[PDB]
Design a protein around this motif. Structure first.
Motif, mmCIF file in Angstrom:
data_model
loop_
_atom_site.group_PDB
_atom_site.id
_atom_site.type_symbol
_atom_site.label_atom_id
_atom_site.label_comp_id
_atom_site.label_asym_id
_atom_site.label_seq_id
_atom_site.Cartn_x
_atom_site.Cartn_y
_atom_site.Cartn_z
ATOM 1 N N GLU A 164 0.247 3.873 8.485
ATOM 2 C CA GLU A 164 0.355 2.760 9.420
ATOM 3 C C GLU A 164 -0.665 1.672 9.105
ATOM 4 O OE1 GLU A 164 -0.186 3.966 13.454
ATOM 5 O OE2 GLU A 164 0.500 2.057 14.294
ATOM 6 N N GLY A 165 -0.175 0.452 8.868
ATOM 7 C CA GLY A 165 -0.952 -0.615 8.273
ATOM 8 C C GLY A 165 -0.773 -0.797 6.781
ATOM 9 N N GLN A 210 -7.565 -6.868 8.095
ATOM 10 C CA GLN A 210 -6.987 -8.061 8.709
ATOM 11 C C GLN A 210 -5.527 -7.856 9.107
ATOM 12 O OE1 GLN A 210 -7.340 -11.499 6.206
ATOM 13 N NE2 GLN A 210 -6.573 -12.926 7.760
ATOM 14 N N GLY A 211 -4.781 -7.099 8.303
ATOM 15 C CA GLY A 211 -3.453 -6.673 8.717
ATOM 16 C C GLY A 211 -3.445 -5.801 9.955
ATOM 17 N N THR A 212 -4.254 -4.741 9.968
ATOM 18 C CA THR A 212 -4.250 -3.886 11.156
ATOM 19 C C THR A 212 -4.734 -4.630 12.404
ATOM 20 O OG1 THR A 212 -6.464 -3.051 10.634
ATOM 21 C CG2 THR A 212 -4.577 -1.831 9.745
ATOM 22 N N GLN A 253 4.180 -14.519 13.401
ATOM 23 C CA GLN A 253 4.019 -13.938 14.733
ATOM 24 C C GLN A 253 3.925 -15.015 15.813
ATOM 25 O OE1 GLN A 253 1.096 -10.866 14.943
ATOM 26 N NE2 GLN A 253 1.049 -10.806 17.186
ATOM 27 N N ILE A 289 2.128 -3.827 3.446
ATOM 28 C CA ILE A 289 1.620 -5.185 3.278
ATOM 29 C C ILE A 289 1.154 -5.372 1.840
ATOM 30 C CG2 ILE A 289 1.000 -5.411 5.704
ATOM 31 C CD1 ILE A 289 -1.929 -4.898 4.901
ATOM 32 N N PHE A 306 -6.463 -5.285 4.235
ATOM 33 C CA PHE A 306 -5.898 -4.164 4.984
ATOM 34 C C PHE A 306 -6.346 -4.177 6.444
ATOM 35 C CE2 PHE A 306 -6.002 0.195 6.534
ATOM 36 C CZ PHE A 306 -4.742 0.657 6.213
ATOM 37 N N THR A 329 2.155 -13.874 7.684
ATOM 38 C CA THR A 329 2.678 -13.060 8.783
ATOM 39 C C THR A 329 2.005 -13.391 10.117
ATOM 40 O OG1 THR A 329 1.114 -11.278 8.285
ATOM 41 C CG2 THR A 329 3.270 -11.201 7.197
ATOM 42 N N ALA A 330 0.719 -13.754 10.086
ATOM 43 C CA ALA A 330 0.010 -14.206 11.281
ATOM 44 C C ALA A 330 0.576 -15.512 11.821
ATOM 45 C CB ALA A 330 -1.479 -14.360 10.974
ATOM 46 N N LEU A 358 -0.916 -12.126 4.537
ATOM 47 C CA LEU A 358 -1.270 -11.860 5.926
ATOM 48 C C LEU A 358 -1.372 -13.136 6.751
ATOM 49 C CD1 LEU A 358 -3.844 -9.259 4.851
ATOM 50 C CD2 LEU A 358 -2.007 -8.715 6.446
ATOM 51 N N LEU A 416 -1.494 -6.853 -0.699
ATOM 52 C CA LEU A 416 -2.935 -7.080 -0.619
ATOM 53 C C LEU A 416 -3.278 -8.492 -1.105
ATOM 54 C CD1 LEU A 416 -4.328 -3.655 -1.893
ATOM 55 C CD2 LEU A 416 -4.011 -4.397 0.470
ATOM 56 N N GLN A 441 -4.150 -7.798 12.942
ATOM 57 C CA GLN A 441 -2.926 -8.472 13.359
ATOM 58 C C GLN A 441 -2.023 -7.529 14.149
ATOM 59 O OE1 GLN A 441 0.823 -10.859 11.166
ATOM 60 N NE2 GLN A 441 -1.204 -10.821 10.189
ATOM 61 N N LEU A 442 -1.692 -6.379 13.563
ATOM 62 C CA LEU A 442 -0.711 -5.480 14.165
ATOM 63 C C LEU A 442 -1.135 -5.031 15.560
ATOM 64 C CD1 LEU A 442 0.120 -3.255 11.062
ATOM 65 C CD2 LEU A 442 1.668 -4.890 12.155
ATOM 66 N N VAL A 487 0.822 -1.211 0.000
ATOM 67 C CA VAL A 487 0.000 0.000 0.000
ATOM 68 C C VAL A 487 0.857 1.262 0.000
ATOM 69 C CG1 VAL A 487 -1.473 1.366 1.581
ATOM 70 C CG2 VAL A 487 -2.144 -0.954 0.906
#
Lengths: 441, 441
Positions: free
Chosen positions: A403-404, B415-417, A421, A407, B413, A417-418, A414, A409, B419-420, A390
């Motif tokens: 912020e966010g 789902q990323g935030t 973590q 990543i 987007f 990355t999940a 995601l 799309l 996560q964060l 983005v």
């Protein structure tokens, strides 16, 4: 030498009797004629040849403006040669300056000078009449290395200069301008371009081109004659429908015949007489038909044939100039005929003008593109799955990163990355509990 | 010099005998004629030539209004040259002023002055009759640097001014206006434009254009003659169907014949007599046919051929002016013929008017766009996935930002935030428990 030192002869070995020791004559293909361009000059007002020259030069004129300023992208651009290079801070400005120079045809703006459009229309006309283009390059008087102008020159006045040994001059004043059969100017290869579309190896061609007007000349003459023939029905012909023969024991006196003409016209002429019928009681009356009841043009197929040939030599569809295509079908031929003329102009510009700025740059005509906001959004809609976070997209828009962002799309990115973590949180737990056990023991 | 100081001659080296030392004559291509524009002036009322001029100038007139005020976007605009620039606060107003100036053709509004539409229709007519456009630029009397008006001038009156040495003047009073073969005015390059569509390098062309009326003149004459021929059947011809020959031992007296004419007309003429048949007992009766039973126009194909040529020189489809296209097929030709005329007008405006305001601006005609509310919503429906938060969109609408905007409308987007947020809450826990352990130890 024409090109350079070579052991093969590239010119007639025995000096042919040129009219002047100082320049090479433009001999006709068969050497039947020595003043070929004064022959061809007589056709430059031909309507078919001008229909071709005008349609082509109108097509060419649309490119002449810079694409940079033309939102549809159609025009020309000055570019770096390598597609992989990114231009430096000074190179981008030098390319813009060269574009501006071309547009203005010179360093300063001057309404008295030809635009690039006028220059191109000129040299297109010259290619299609003479198959010879010339333009002079004028350098700064204080600094001979700095180009100031380029101006198109009348090709019928430009000849190759020849040494007393009959060899074409190289390295010196390769060209002369001849007016009234005396030399009025001379030029080096640096100061004057020559461009030729239809080259020949033929020794006696002496480096000159070959006009389609020369090749097609018989066809143009036949055209002219058939046009004069069809026009002379009106201009010079007898249109007389026929003779009304009235006959009796003796011809009428002239007085009798002229008052019979008055009886006729007062009763039968124009709209006023239009439906009356004369009664006449002569011994016999006959009407002799001397022309067809319905006249029209003749030799239409002959004309079509001729123009199909001339169009085929120039590489144009007859349908573009208002004639049946005897092939019976057919844009493709327009493209095939216009693209070589564009490439020829490009080649001339690259060799003669841009070469003053060195080989790193290139001049090209460029068409438009189908790269609307819709198309760019479709592309980026794929690039953001494949490449772009983005924030890279927003930065390319000049829009602040968020912020966010950072990543891709894609849901799988995601989900990865999940996972990672959780992987981190597990290894953190494992390693801390390992340390705590070591500290306990 | 015509363009500037050059070592190639650009004019006839020996001074040809111009009628006047003070200006260059407009010689015909073959020099058969010296007063070419008074020849061409005779065709300006030709119906075919006027059908072309009127269709083209009607097409051009739609652009003349500003696109800015025209909701379909069709018209002209004054723009910055670079597409990448954003105009400054004063530049946006200067561009609007230049647009208004063009529309008004001058600084103040004045109903007595031509609009831009009238100006364009004038210069289009002049291009297609003479291939020469001229307009005078009138500067403020108090401040010679400030342009006040531009007005189109009769091209048949404008000639290049020539030095006593027969050279065309440059830098001085380059132009003269000639009326009744005396100079009534003179102009610099600053005060008068000249525009030419069909330039030539030919030395004797002396910088003048080349009208298609000159090239096609034979065709126009042939057209005129065939039209007169077809009209003269009615205007001048004998329409008489035939002669009724009645014959006997001697011709009737005139009295007998005139009362036979009364017997005839009282019994057989008009609707009243229309189906009666005369009985006549002459020794023999004959009717001699002198014309075809069914007359129609002649040389129709000849006319079509001629007009196809003339249309091909002007670059127009004959079907647009009511003639068969002898190519047999075909909008594309309309576009190809109108776009060069628009570009020519643009080039003239840019060189002569906008250049008073400097090179940062450009004048262009612009077509409409397919950018309805639907299209803008489709685009933004992609941009809000790719670029735009809800609040950027609303701000572009002038609509207040909302709490819960600042997000891209993509589930990934969020789902990323989401996560964060968890990432933050974990690192917060980890670091606080690390600190609490350090404080315990």
């Amino acid at each position: 030498s024409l090109y350079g030192q070579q052991q093969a002869y590239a010119e007639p070995f025995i000096e042919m009797m040129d009219t002047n020791p100082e320049f090479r004559d433009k001999r006709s293909y068969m050497k039947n004629e020595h003043n070929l361009h004064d022959v061809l000059k007589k056709f430059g007002n031909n309507p078919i040849l001008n229909a071709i020259i005008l349609t082509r030069s109108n097509q060419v004129a649309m490119y002449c403006q810079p694409a940079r300023y033309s939102e549809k992208g159609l025009g020309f651009e000055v570019r770096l040669r390598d597609l992989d290079a990114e231009p430096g801070r000074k190179e981008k400005e030098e390319m813009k300056r060269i574009e501006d120079f071309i547009v203005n045809t010179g360093k300063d703006k001057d309404v008295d000078r030809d635009s690039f459009q006028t220059f191109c229309k000129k040299i297109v006309r010259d290619t299609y009449i003479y198959d010879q283009v010339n333009f002079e390059k004028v350098f700064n008087k204080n600094n001979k290395t700095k180009l100031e102008k380029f101006i198109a020159v009348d090709p019928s006045t430009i000849f190759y200069a020849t040494d007393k040994k009959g060899k074409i001059i190289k390295g010196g004043k390769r060209f002369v301008q001849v007016v009234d059969k005396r030399v009025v100017a001379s030029f080096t290869s640096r100061e004057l371009a020559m461009g030729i579309r239809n080259p020949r190896t033929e020794l006696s061609s002496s480096g000159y081109g070959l006009s389609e007007v020369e090749i097609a000349m018989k066809e143009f003459i036949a055209y002219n004659n058939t046009e004069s023939f069809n026009d002379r029905f009106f201009s010079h012909g007898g249109t007389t429908r026929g003779i009304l023969q009235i006959r009796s024991d003796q011809q009428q006196s002239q007085h009798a015949l002229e008052n019979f003409k008055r009886e006729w016209k007062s009763s039968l002429s124009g709209i006023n007489g239009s439906w009356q019928i004369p009664v006449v009681m002569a011994d016999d009356i006959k009407f002799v038909n001397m022309t067809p009841t319905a006249n029209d043009m003749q030799f239409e197929k002959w004309l079509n044939y001729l123009i199909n040939i001339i169009s085929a030599l120039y590489g144009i569809d007859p349908a573009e100039i208002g004639f049946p295509n005897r092939g019976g079908a057919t844009q493709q031929s327009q493209n095939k005929g216009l693209q070589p003329l564009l490439r020829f102009i490009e080649d001339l510009v690259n060799r003669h003008i841009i070469s003053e700025y060195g080989d790193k740059y290139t001049f090209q005509f460029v068409g438009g593109d189908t790269k609307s906001a819709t198309d760019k959004l479709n592309i980026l809609k794929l690039e953001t799955q494949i490449f772009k976070t983005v924030n890279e997209a927003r930065e390319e828009q000049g829009k602040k990163p968020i912020e966010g962002g950072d990543i891709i799309l894609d849901a799988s990115f995601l989900q990865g990355t999940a996972q990672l973590q959780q992987d981190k949180q597990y290894n953190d737990g494992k390693q801390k509990e390992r340390l705590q056990m070591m500290m306990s023991l």
